Amino acid sequence: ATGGYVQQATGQASFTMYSGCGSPACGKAASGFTAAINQLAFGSAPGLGAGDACGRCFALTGNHDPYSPNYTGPFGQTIVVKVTDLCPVQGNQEFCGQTTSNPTNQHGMPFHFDICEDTGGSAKFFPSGHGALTGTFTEVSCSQWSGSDGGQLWNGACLSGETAPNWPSTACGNKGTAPS
Numbered sequence: 001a002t003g004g005y006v007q008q009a010t011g012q013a014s015f016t017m018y019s020g021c022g023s024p025a026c027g028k029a030a031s032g033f034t035a036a037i038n039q040l041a042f043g044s045a046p047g048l049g050a051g052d053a054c055g056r057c058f059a060l061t062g063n064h065d066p067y068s069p070n071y072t073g074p075f076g077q078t079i080v081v082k083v084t085d086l087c088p089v090q091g092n093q094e095f096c097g098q099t100t101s102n103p104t105n106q107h108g109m110p111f112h113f114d115i116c117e118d119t120g121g122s123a124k125f126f127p128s129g130h131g132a133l134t135g136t137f138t139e140v141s142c143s144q145w146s147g148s149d150g151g152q153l154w155n156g157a158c159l160s161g162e163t164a165p166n167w168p169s170t171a172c173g174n175k176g177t178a179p180s
């Protein structure tokens with residue numbers, strides 16, 4: 001997409017959980033299940049505000065525990081998240097370090113979703129004792145997502161991807177250039 005970001009509506013991803021998604025990089029939180037997405041897909045960099053992932057909804061499915069490859073299941077439920085946040089390259093080299101020159105992370109995944117624990121998404125997705133997975137995602141209509149957006153936290157905040165057709169398309173728009 002514009003900026004060199006790798007923004008595909010479906011693919012393979014890794015998955016983790018995180019705490020504290022109430023003041024996220026898109027500039028609005030939401031009450032439903034939410035995630036951060038890796039920088040190369042988010043469409044912005046730290047401090048630059050919303051990227052084009054903001055507000056888009058994705059169905060996530062885990063099917064592998066990369067730390068325990070002998071585990072065959074059960075996995076969690078498929079969940080629908082709204083992307084509200086950025087998982088930056090900086091400080092997240094294992095999972096969110098995809099760049100235009102090296103577009104997969106240390107698990108070979110071209111995307112990563114960090115699922116917010118606060119609002120319940122991670123408890124639906126991660127079995128007890130298996131807090132990091134790999135699997136698939138596919139962008140869906142936000143008709144498939146339960147929840148309500150929070151208020152703007154700063155000027156330029158954006159979740160307009162929530163009413164956009166799936167990628168390829170533009171809603172909030174990308175900021176600057178993807179990490180190289």
Ligand SMILES: OC[C@H]1O[C@@H](O[C@H]2[C@H](O)[C@@H](O)[C@H](O[C@H]3[C@H](O)[C@@H](O)[C@H](O[C@H]4[C@H](O)[C@@H](O)[C@H](O[C@H]5[C@H](O)[C@@H](O)[C@@H](O)O[C@@H]5CO)O[C@@H]4CO)O[C@@H]3CO)O[C@@H]2CO)[C@H](O)[C@@H](O)[C@@H]1O
Pocket residue numbers: 015016017018019065067068070071087091092093094095096114129130131132
């Ligand atoms: O940077 C992105 C994001 O990260 C968030 O933290 C992540 C973190 O990055 C990730 O490394 C971490 O991964 C955990 C994982 O959650 C956990 O399930 C896994 O547990 C393993 C355990 O280490 C193994 O020892 C055990 O092996 C057993 C075998 O399963 C069994 O068959 C037998 O052989 O016995 C073995 C030994 O007991 O299996 C467990 C399950 O696979 O360990 C991983 C590495 O620590 O997950 C976290 C949370 O998602 C972070 O919160 C966020 O802020 C950040 O943005």
Ligand SMILES: OC[C@H]1O[C@@H](O[C@H]2[C@H](O)[C@@H](O)[C@H](O[C@H]3[C@H](O)[C@@H](O)[C@H](O[C@H]4[C@H](O)[C@@H](O)[C@H](O[C@H]5[C@H](O)[C@@H](O)[C@H](O)O[C@@H]5CO)O[C@@H]4CO)O[C@@H]3CO)O[C@@H]2CO)[C@H](O)[C@@H](O)[C@@H]1O
Pocket residue numbers: 018019020021023024025026027036037045046047048049050085086087088092114153154155156
């Ligand atoms: O008034 C001056 C100027 O302001 C502009 O608006 C600014 C606003 O002032 C800033 O506060 C705001 O800052 C946001 C950053 O742009 C955004 O990148 C950052 O995103 C964070 C996110 O908050 C955080 O949750 C996330 O953590 C991840 C890490 O991987 C781990 O720490 C965690 O465990 O897991 C998560 C997910 O993986 O990190 C990201 C990236 O660091 O959030 C900031 C606060 O929301 O930027 C605004 C835009 O520049 C205003 O537009 C101008 O008009 C005005 O002049």
